[PDB]
Nucleic acid binder design. Structure first.
Ligand SMILES: [Mg+2]
Ligand SMILES: [Mg+2]
Ligand SMILES: [Mg+2]
Ligand SMILES: [Mg+2]
Ligand SMILES: [Mg+2]
Ligand SMILES: [Mg+2]
Ligand SMILES: [Mg+2]
Ligand SMILES: [Mg+2]
Ligand SMILES: [Mg+2]
Ligand SMILES: [Mg+2]
Ligand SMILES: [Mg+2]
Ligand SMILES: [Mg+2]
Ligand SMILES: [Mg+2]
Ligand SMILES: [Mg+2]
Ligand SMILES: [Mg+2]
Ligand SMILES: [Mg+2]
Ligand SMILES: [Mg+2]
Ligand SMILES: [Mg+2]
Ligand SMILES: [Mg+2]
Ligand SMILES: [Mg+2]
Ligand SMILES: [Mg+2]
Ligand SMILES: [Mg+2]
Ligand SMILES: [Mg+2]
Ligand SMILES: [Mg+2]
Ligand SMILES: [Mg+2]
Ligand SMILES: [Mg+2]
Ligand SMILES: [Mg+2]
Ligand SMILES: [Mg+2]
Ligand SMILES: [Mg+2]
Ligand SMILES: [Mg+2]
Ligand SMILES: [Mg+2]
Ligand SMILES: [Mg+2]
Ligand SMILES: [Mg+2]
Ligand SMILES: [Mg+2]
Ligand SMILES: [Mg+2]
Ligand SMILES: [Mg+2]
Ligand SMILES: [Mg+2]
Ligand SMILES: [Mg+2]
Ligand SMILES: [Mg+2]
Ligand SMILES: [Mg+2]
Ligand SMILES: [Mg+2]
Ligand SMILES: [Mg+2]
Ligand SMILES: [Mg+2]
Ligand SMILES: [Mg+2]
Ligand SMILES: [Mg+2]
Ligand SMILES: [Mg+2]
Ligand SMILES: [Mg+2]
Ligand SMILES: [Mg+2]
Ligand SMILES: [Mg+2]
Ligand SMILES: [Mg+2]
Ligand SMILES: [Mg+2]
Ligand SMILES: [Mg+2]
Ligand SMILES: [Mg+2]
Ligand SMILES: [Mg+2]
Ligand SMILES: [Mg+2]
Ligand SMILES: [Mg+2]
Ligand SMILES: [Mg+2]
Ligand SMILES: [Mg+2]
Ligand SMILES: [Mg+2]
Ligand SMILES: [Mg+2]
Ligand SMILES: [Mg+2]
Ligand SMILES: [Mg+2]
Ligand SMILES: [Mg+2]
Ligand SMILES: [Mg+2]
Ligand SMILES: [Mg+2]
Ligand SMILES: [Mg+2]
Ligand SMILES: [Mg+2]
Ligand SMILES: [Mg+2]
Ligand SMILES: [Mg+2]
Ligand SMILES: [Mg+2]
Ligand SMILES: [Mg+2]
Ligand SMILES: [Mg+2]
Ligand SMILES: [Mg+2]
Ligand SMILES: [Mg+2]
Ligand SMILES: [Mg+2]
Ligand SMILES: [Mg+2]
Ligand SMILES: [Mg+2]
Ligand SMILES: [Mg+2]
Ligand SMILES: [Mg+2]
Ligand SMILES: [Mg+2]
Ligand SMILES: [Mg+2]
Ligand SMILES: [Mg+2]
Ligand SMILES: [Mg+2]
Ligand SMILES: [Mg+2]
Ligand SMILES: [Mg+2]
Ligand SMILES: [Mg+2]
Ligand SMILES: [Mg+2]
Ligand SMILES: [Mg+2]
Ligand SMILES: [Mg+2]
Ligand SMILES: [Mg+2]
Ligand SMILES: [Mg+2]
Ligand SMILES: [Mg+2]
Ligand SMILES: [Mg+2]
Ligand SMILES: [Mg+2]
Ligand SMILES: [Mg+2]
Ligand SMILES: [Mg+2]
Ligand SMILES: [Mg+2]
Ligand SMILES: [Mg+2]
Ligand SMILES: [Mg+2]
Ligand SMILES: [Mg+2]
Ligand SMILES: [Mg+2]
Ligand SMILES: [Mg+2]
Ligand SMILES: [Mg+2]
Ligand SMILES: [Mg+2]
Ligand SMILES: [Mg+2]
Ligand SMILES: [Mg+2]
Ligand SMILES: [Mg+2]
Ligand SMILES: [Mg+2]
Ligand SMILES: [Mg+2]
Ligand SMILES: [Mg+2]
Ligand SMILES: [Mg+2]
Ligand SMILES: [Mg+2]
Ligand SMILES: [Mg+2]
Ligand SMILES: [Mg+2]
Ligand SMILES: [Mg+2]
Ligand SMILES: [Mg+2]
Ligand SMILES: [Mg+2]
Ligand SMILES: [Mg+2]
Ligand SMILES: [Mg+2]
Ligand SMILES: [Mg+2]
Ligand SMILES: [Mg+2]
Ligand SMILES: [Mg+2]
Ligand SMILES: [Mg+2]
Ligand SMILES: [Mg+2]
Ligand SMILES: [Mg+2]
Ligand SMILES: [Mg+2]
Ligand SMILES: [Mg+2]
Ligand SMILES: [Mg+2]
Ligand SMILES: [Mg+2]
Ligand SMILES: [Mg+2]
Ligand SMILES: [Mg+2]
Ligand SMILES: [Mg+2]
Ligand SMILES: [Mg+2]
Ligand SMILES: [Mg+2]
Ligand SMILES: [Mg+2]
Ligand SMILES: [Mg+2]
Ligand SMILES: [Mg+2]
Ligand SMILES: [Mg+2]
Ligand SMILES: [Mg+2]
Ligand SMILES: [Mg+2]
Ligand SMILES: [Mg+2]
Ligand SMILES: [Mg+2]
Ligand SMILES: [Mg+2]
Ligand SMILES: [Mg+2]
Ligand SMILES: [Mg+2]
Ligand SMILES: [Mg+2]
Ligand SMILES: [Mg+2]
Ligand SMILES: [Mg+2]
Ligand SMILES: [Mg+2]
Ligand SMILES: [Mg+2]
Ligand SMILES: [Mg+2]
Ligand SMILES: [Mg+2]
Ligand SMILES: [Mg+2]
Ligand SMILES: [Mg+2]
Ligand SMILES: [Mg+2]
Ligand SMILES: [Mg+2]
Ligand SMILES: [Mg+2]
Ligand SMILES: [Mg+2]
Ligand SMILES: [Mg+2]
Ligand SMILES: [Mg+2]
Ligand SMILES: [Mg+2]
Ligand SMILES: [Mg+2]
Ligand SMILES: [Mg+2]
Ligand SMILES: [Mg+2]
Ligand SMILES: [Mg+2]
Ligand SMILES: [Mg+2]
Ligand SMILES: [Mg+2]
Ligand SMILES: [Mg+2]
Ligand SMILES: [Mg+2]
Ligand SMILES: [Mg+2]
Ligand SMILES: [Mg+2]
Ligand SMILES: [Mg+2]
Ligand SMILES: [Mg+2]
Ligand SMILES: [Mg+2]
Ligand SMILES: [Mg+2]
Ligand SMILES: [Mg+2]
Ligand SMILES: [Mg+2]
Ligand SMILES: [Mg+2]
Ligand SMILES: [Mg+2]
Ligand SMILES: [Mg+2]
Ligand SMILES: [Mg+2]
Ligand SMILES: [Mg+2]
Ligand SMILES: [Mg+2]
Ligand SMILES: [Mg+2]
Ligand SMILES: [Mg+2]
Ligand SMILES: [Mg+2]
Ligand SMILES: [Mg+2]
Ligand SMILES: [Mg+2]
Ligand SMILES: [Mg+2]
Ligand SMILES: [Mg+2]
Ligand SMILES: [Mg+2]
Ligand SMILES: [Mg+2]
Lengths: 48, 275
RNA sequence: UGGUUCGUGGAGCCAUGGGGGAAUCUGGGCGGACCACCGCCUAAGGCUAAGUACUCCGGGUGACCGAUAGCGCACCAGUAC
RNA sequence: GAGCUAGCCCUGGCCAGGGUGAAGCUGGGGUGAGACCCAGUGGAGGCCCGAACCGGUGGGGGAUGCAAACCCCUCGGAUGA
RNA sequence: GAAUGCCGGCAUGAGUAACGAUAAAGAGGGUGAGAAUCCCUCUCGCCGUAAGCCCAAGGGUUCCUACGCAAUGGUCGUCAGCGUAGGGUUAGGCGGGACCUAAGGUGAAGCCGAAAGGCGUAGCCGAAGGGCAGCCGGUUAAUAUUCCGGCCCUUCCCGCAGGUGCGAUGGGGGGACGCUCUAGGCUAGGGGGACCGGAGCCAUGGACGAGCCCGGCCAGAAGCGCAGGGUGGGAGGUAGGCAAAUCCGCCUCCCAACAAGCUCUGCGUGGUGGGGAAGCCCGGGUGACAACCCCCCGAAGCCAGGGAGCCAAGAAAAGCCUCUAAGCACAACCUGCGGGAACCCGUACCGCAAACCGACACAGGUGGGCGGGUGCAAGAGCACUCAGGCGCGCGGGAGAACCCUCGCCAAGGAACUCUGCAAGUUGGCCCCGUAACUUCGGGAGAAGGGGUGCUCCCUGGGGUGAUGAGCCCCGGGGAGCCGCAGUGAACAGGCUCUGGCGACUGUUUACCAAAAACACAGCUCUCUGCGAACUCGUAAGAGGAGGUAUAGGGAGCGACGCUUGCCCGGUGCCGGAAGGUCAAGGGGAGGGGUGCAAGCCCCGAACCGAAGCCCCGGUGAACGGCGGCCGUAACUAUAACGGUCCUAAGGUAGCGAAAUUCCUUGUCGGGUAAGUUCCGACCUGCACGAAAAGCGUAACGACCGGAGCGCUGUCUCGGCGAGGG
RNA sequence: CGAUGUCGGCUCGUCGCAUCCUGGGGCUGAAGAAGGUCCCAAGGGUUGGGCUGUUCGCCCAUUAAAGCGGCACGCGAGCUG
RNA sequence: UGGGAGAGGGUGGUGGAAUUCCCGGAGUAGCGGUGAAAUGCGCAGAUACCGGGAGGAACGCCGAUGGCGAAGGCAGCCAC
RNA sequence: CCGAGGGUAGGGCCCGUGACUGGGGCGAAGUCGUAACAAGGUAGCUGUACCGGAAGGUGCGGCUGGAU
RNA sequence: AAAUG
RNA sequence: GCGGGGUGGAGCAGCCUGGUAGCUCGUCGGGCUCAUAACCCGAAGGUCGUCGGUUCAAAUCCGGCCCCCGCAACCA
């Protein structure tokens, strides 16, 4: 049966991407929250 | 002049289609078309503002000249009559002696190859457009500018027409297709005659398919829903309304006058619509 | 309408969205409706250190913990997953 | 968070084969002229039988399963919403 | 010591369930300490519109080589998608970018919002759309249209010659399009051949044969040829294409019009360049100087922007062509030749799966192309099979019960059971033949019969060719042969009668309901005159709609047929410059506080004062409602009539123990040996009823009842046999 | 109530006696045959079908007779639903 | 051949009287209706009277015991 | 080969029959109305249409077989 | 106005 | 189980708020008619379901019983 995860590299980058985060005050806060916690990757990775 | 079909399929029993008799050209004029962006009933926000629309066959919009006072006193030969999927009216292609080409709505009885012209001194002849004050009272007319130099807004649907009942001051009095009587300014241009394709209302669709082809998505009753969705919803088994029939939003749908009262156009309306 | 202890209360005072709209000291505001007396202070321009607040950072010290405790992590942790 | 699901918009792709035989057109008959009748050509349709493809009617098995919805037989639509 | 406590650890169940499809295995020979599991060979089975091959998405070194087996692999393991190390991805022409735009996103201008921010024309981004120049062959353990060989091609820069008013982000043309059917001519591909090439083979009773088996092509510049696409030529006038303009458009004249010509492709040929088997011998070598031809079938693909028909009326920008403007004409553009230049990223491998999405090497899910041969009417169906790929990563024994899945049965044939649930029967093509009823299409494949294999003779027609032969495609008649059975295996409807419901194909509770529910054309009401009504948003702004009452929103009913009665008292809506009511405000009679006072401050009647409400009316396809008790006919029984209280007004037509009937298995009739269900009637309708529509209706239904035939392991009633456990 | 699965049917039984048959009797308004009522007696037996979800019941065709009841209205870690 | 009559028929166009409804002026205690009343209407300003507008239907006198058509039927006026 | 006939299947016409139902026919003195023959007390009738316990009433149009 | 025998 | 009702012969007022029973038809008597109905003028008839209680006094207010309709009987 078709499951919930059908990966698409263009989508993952346009939706959760870094340039997407910067464009909204929410997403900007998303980055600030992750840096303070000290995560190693602020954005999901994708090879493009 | 509608055509029928033998009932060789159950949906084809009652279907009817237009004869397409007056149509002289199978394809439009390239220079006069542009893309009609299908809205799907959704606005710039993305929300649906009008339910149950979209999914219709793809169409190319055909530019219409709702301002014939543009080219005053320059005649034109009726080149052809084409089919427009963007309105109920047939349209007619015009080749001006000026060389420019334009579409106008095709009035009834307009035959290809005749002269049409617009101007205060233009003859009273089907197809010619004049300001209202220069049109004999009583004559049929259509494609009426509501206000001067703002584009024809009235009497554009298939077979519609507007009549002239008299003049008062700068304004003239019309009987709109709805029956309403309204003072319209004389300087508003208007095309004489009645809109063509009068048999449009006798088209029997035939099946749910043709509802979709035109872009009409299925419309579901209110009583077939649930409380959160519609006022009529819910109820064990089938059920009557149980309240004054109300729109999905609460305001009643049985004879509730919606027009704003203090609208300044009230001064210029003489008689509310008839029937 | 808001602030003040003040929830329309006798409800001033400070601030103010709408309306009407003065004076230049013999001008003006306040002393809890309002009046008089007697007093206080000069609105509608602006700046001003020190005394106060916090602890990512450095140090000192614990009748603070001692690897299920103590920061989630004494160890390659905001990692594996 | 619409990479599942629901709707819409932009742009591409797919639907073996077979059967039925609408209108129209040509001829002939007919009539004052017509309607109309018959044979032929014609190839319409949310038409029929039926793969792919999209479904999930009935039964059985599976029930710590191959599987947090599957497998077998059977069954519906299959040029159209 | 307990909180189905938290964390961790070790037991129990238990050597029990299970080892992930029942497509299947055996033997021999290698290596190794060790082998059913690794490798080589022979034999056997499995898919073959794939379980084969090529892409795209996703995955990220899993590809190749060497060396290894603690763990990973549902057992083992020398093996591997695992561990270690080395190696491996080559492009002007394939794809993407330095070109274009679509939804959409962003957004100079501009608008909006407490802040954050939200809109918005031009512009810009945005592709699996448009546009764009490479085909075949070889080679590596691994890459190749990328390296190599042969034959082609594009753009840019410079130089040169020839030609011309050159020049663009501005004008115009073109790009440029739907669904169904479809002509002609080719190619892909396929079949045959006594013709050409070939190593061989004679078996086991026959065959030295016109015998068997293998193979008989691919690409190709200019030119040529066949087949199609596209486009008329000149002159004059011009006010339109937001400047100009010879271009375009419009008008007039002249010549040409299925043409011809000019132009672009597609196929064939083409200098020339490669490929090239079975078999035998150890991936290579031979075969071989390999041959490379003829006939038939033939595309959904190519010519292509073909043609016809129809209604729902079928993208934009750029490249390309032309037109002119500043400018500039020592230039610049174009055509041709020569010499130079040509950058970034991707190329391995998996890719219907053990490497992707499902926690797993998971019986599930994943878009596009090719997908061969024979036969069965056909076909991507079924069966067998080529190339190619696998036997699904535990086996070996035994031959109990029991479950799963499958096969058979005496006599009976629904007695089973809630129900024929299930399993049988029927089954494809041909010809005869086919009822009520109907909306004239239908019902209808109704039903129900007969034929079907092979051989000999005779004979019609079509395609190809040429008109014949050859090959191919359709048939027709006569005489005969065999078997239990001739669509001899596999794929392939049981049928009929009568009700309720819904018109119909369709849609839904992904994941227990596919229905009688939703939707649907169609009917009716009602709203809206444009900056519409309505909707989203505080707004701006959008949608409505680049629509205009034959249009648009809202509500109910749901084809069509015949119809839809009475009540407007209450509620809702519509109408109603009177009156009554009514807050702010106006108004200020009249009072009060205080000051010596001028004055300051507060209370405050009548009267003037919108919508709304009361009040008068209208309105049912608006919300809703539509009586009781009593008497009476020359038998009885029942009341067509009458009496009386009440209502706003008292249920009309049609139907009715119904999807509704409590009493109920109402009563009568049918069908049955027997019928609480079903069917037809009756009517005292506990409690149908006319757009929450009423009564019907041909056709349709994996909907829900009742009946019959056919056939059956459903059953009396069980028995045997097969395979996986 | 940190679960005692609830009607009916199939399957499989087992018990009680207030016995329906069969056996042994008393009385009889018992002539015989055949019955009526009561006593003893539970060893064995107690059919098939129609309708309804039915238990019960009604009906058809038989029968020696077509008995009533208990075992969680026996029995769902056995099934049906 | 030449003439005559006629509501014979079909299409298009057109005239006034009257009825109802709306707007304006003026005006007030009833109008309307029957055998006689009542329902209705009317101070929220009706009837009656003046001016203006919209819309449909039928064609007074002429006209008749008349004319035309096969029949049903055909009547303002102009034209084809 | 034909063939009496027998079996199977589906049609056609006719006769009888059937819960129930529709009107109709007649049948000395049932009930309720009074529509027609007088201008029947609303002139009659007719075709058609809707409505009514019943005859009948009304609408449109036609006839005189209508009197004064 | 106004029925029936 | 809950609600309403019973009164001349029939169908209803009066009951709430005690003192007085009324409306229509019918029945009876007499009128008009040839006669009947219709119509006109008169007239009679009800101790309020029953029983008990309160009160000076009960159709009337309160209790018990009979009958008459009407509503409810739900989760299992
Ligand atoms: Mg997951
Ligand atoms: Mg997807
Ligand atoms: Mg992608
Ligand atoms: Mg780091
Ligand atoms: Mg958005
Ligand atoms: Mg919602
Ligand atoms: Mg609501
Ligand atoms: Mg409701
Ligand atoms: Mg409901
Ligand atoms: Mg209901
Ligand atoms: Mg509103
Ligand atoms: Mg406050
Ligand atoms: Mg308070
Ligand atoms: Mg207080
Ligand atoms: Mg305050
Ligand atoms: Mg100051
Ligand atoms: Mg200051
Ligand atoms: Mg601190
Ligand atoms: Mg510190
Ligand atoms: Mg310590
Ligand atoms: Mg220590
Ligand atoms: Mg710790
Ligand atoms: Mg320790
Ligand atoms: Mg530890
Ligand atoms: Mg978002
Ligand atoms: Mg989506
Ligand atoms: Mg395919
Ligand atoms: Mg086909
Ligand atoms: Mg097909
Ligand atoms: Mg075909
Ligand atoms: Mg065909
Ligand atoms: Mg056929
Ligand atoms: Mg044709
Ligand atoms: Mg013809
Ligand atoms: Mg035909
Ligand atoms: Mg044909
Ligand atoms: Mg089928
Ligand atoms: Mg089908
Ligand atoms: Mg799918
Ligand atoms: Mg679905
Ligand atoms: Mg299933
Ligand atoms: Mg199941
Ligand atoms: Mg499950
Ligand atoms: Mg199927
Ligand atoms: Mg079908
Ligand atoms: Mg479509
Ligand atoms: Mg304890
Ligand atoms: Mg537990
Ligand atoms: Mg426990
Ligand atoms: Mg063991
Ligand atoms: Mg055990
Ligand atoms: Mg075991
Ligand atoms: Mg085992
Ligand atoms: Mg199997
Ligand atoms: Mg071995
Ligand atoms: Mg193995
Ligand atoms: Mg990739
Ligand atoms: Mg090795
Ligand atoms: Mg292992
Ligand atoms: Mg490795
Ligand atoms: Mg190259
Ligand atoms: Mg560059
Ligand atoms: Mg761009
Ligand atoms: Mg700005
Ligand atoms: Mg911004
Ligand atoms: Mg934006
Ligand atoms: Mg492309
Ligand atoms: Mg390219
Ligand atoms: Mg490779
Ligand atoms: Mg190659
Ligand atoms: Mg090369
Ligand atoms: Mg020049
Ligand atoms: Mg030029
Ligand atoms: Mg252009
Ligand atoms: Mg062809
Ligand atoms: Mg072939
Ligand atoms: Mg060959
Ligand atoms: Mg050969
Ligand atoms: Mg040879
Ligand atoms: Mg031999
Ligand atoms: Mg062979
Ligand atoms: Mg060639
Ligand atoms: Mg040509
Ligand atoms: Mg020309
Ligand atoms: Mg010129
Ligand atoms: Mg010009
Ligand atoms: Mg110009
Ligand atoms: Mg020119
Ligand atoms: Mg030219
Ligand atoms: Mg070529
Ligand atoms: Mg050699
Ligand atoms: Mg040789
Ligand atoms: Mg050919
Ligand atoms: Mg194709
Ligand atoms: Mg093409
Ligand atoms: Mg074409
Ligand atoms: Mg555009
Ligand atoms: Mg551009
Ligand atoms: Mg110049
Ligand atoms: Mg590759
Ligand atoms: Mg698959
Ligand atoms: Mg594939
Ligand atoms: Mg694999
Ligand atoms: Mg495996
Ligand atoms: Mg798998
Ligand atoms: Mg996996
Ligand atoms: Mg093929
Ligand atoms: Mg094939
Ligand atoms: Mg074949
Ligand atoms: Mg054969
Ligand atoms: Mg197959
Ligand atoms: Mg093989
Ligand atoms: Mg594979
Ligand atoms: Mg494997
Ligand atoms: Mg056998
Ligand atoms: Mg048997
Ligand atoms: Mg047998
Ligand atoms: Mg039988
Ligand atoms: Mg039974
Ligand atoms: Mg049944
Ligand atoms: Mg069932
Ligand atoms: Mg079955
Ligand atoms: Mg029949
Ligand atoms: Mg027929
Ligand atoms: Mg048949
Ligand atoms: Mg044979
Ligand atoms: Mg019926
Ligand atoms: Mg029924
Ligand atoms: Mg349906
Ligand atoms: Mg479901
Ligand atoms: Mg509709
Ligand atoms: Mg209408
Ligand atoms: Mg708003
Ligand atoms: Mg707006
Ligand atoms: Mg707009
Ligand atoms: Mg509408
Ligand atoms: Mg409905
Ligand atoms: Mg209905
Ligand atoms: Mg109604
Ligand atoms: Mg009402
Ligand atoms: Mg009302
Ligand atoms: Mg109102
Ligand atoms: Mg006031
Ligand atoms: Mg004083
Ligand atoms: Mg008011
Ligand atoms: Mg009501
Ligand atoms: Mg009697
Ligand atoms: Mg009735
Ligand atoms: Mg009723
Ligand atoms: Mg009726
Ligand atoms: Mg129903
Ligand atoms: Mg019976
Ligand atoms: Mg019977
Ligand atoms: Mg039966
Ligand atoms: Mg039932
Ligand atoms: Mg009864
Ligand atoms: Mg009903
Ligand atoms: Mg009802
Ligand atoms: Mg109704
Ligand atoms: Mg019905
Ligand atoms: Mg119906
Ligand atoms: Mg019918
Ligand atoms: Mg029906
Ligand atoms: Mg269906
Ligand atoms: Mg059935
Ligand atoms: Mg069995
Ligand atoms: Mg067995
Ligand atoms: Mg076995
Ligand atoms: Mg427990
Ligand atoms: Mg329970
Ligand atoms: Mg005993
Ligand atoms: Mg005993
Ligand atoms: Mg006894
Ligand atoms: Mg005995
Ligand atoms: Mg005895
Ligand atoms: Mg019973
Ligand atoms: Mg029995
Ligand atoms: Mg027992
Ligand atoms: Mg019990
Ligand atoms: Mg059930
Ligand atoms: Mg079930
Ligand atoms: Mg003459
Ligand atoms: Mg007036
Ligand atoms: Mg009055
Ligand atoms: Mg009055
Ligand atoms: Mg005559
Ligand atoms: Mg015979
Ligand atoms: Mg015979
Ligand atoms: Mg009447
Ligand atoms: Mg009488
Ligand atoms: Mg009492
Ligand atoms: Mg008493």
């Amino acid at each position: 049966m078709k499951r919930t995860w059908q990966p698409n590299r263009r989508k993952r980058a346009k939706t959760h991407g870094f340039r997407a985060r910067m464009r909204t005050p929410g997403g900007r806060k998303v980055l600030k929250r992750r840096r303070q916690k000290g995560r190693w990757r602020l954005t999901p990775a994708v090879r493009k | 002049a509608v055509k029928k079909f033998k009932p060789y399929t159950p949906s084809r029993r009652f279907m009817t289609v237009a004869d397409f008799s007056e149509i002289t050209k199978t394809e439009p004029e390239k220079s006069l078309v542009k893309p009609l962006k299908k809205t799907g009933g959704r606005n710039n926000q993305g929300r649906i503002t009008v339910r149950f629309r979209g999914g219709g066959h793809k169409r190319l919009y055909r530019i219409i000249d709702f301002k014939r006072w543009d080219k005053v006193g320059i005649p034109a030969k009726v080149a052809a009559i084409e089919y427009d999927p963007n309105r109920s009216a047939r349209i007619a292609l015009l080749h001006y002696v000026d060389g420019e080409k334009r579409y106008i709505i095709a009035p009834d009885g307009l035959q290809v190859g005749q002269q049409v012209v617009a101007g205060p001194d233009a003859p009273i002849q089907v197809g010619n457009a004049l300001p209202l004050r220069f049109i004999p009272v009583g004559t049929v007319v259509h494609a009426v500018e509501l206000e001067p130099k703002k584009g024809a807004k009235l009497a554009r649907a298939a077979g519609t027409s507007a009549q002239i009942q008299g003049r008062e001051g700068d304004y003239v009095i019309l009987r709109l297709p709805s029956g309403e009587l309204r003072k319209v300014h004389g300087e508003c241009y208007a095309t004489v005659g009645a809109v063509g394709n009068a048999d449009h209302k006798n088209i029997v669709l035939g099946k749910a398919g043709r509802s979709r082809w035109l872009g009409r998505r299925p419309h579901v009753r209110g009583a077939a829903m649930n409380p959160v969705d519609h006022p009529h919803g819910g109820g064990e088994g089938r059920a009557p309304r149980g309240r004054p029939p109300a729109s999905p939003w609460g305001w009643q749908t049985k004879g509730l006058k919606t027009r704003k009262r203090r609208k300044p156009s009230s001064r210029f309306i003489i008689a509310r619509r008839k029937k």
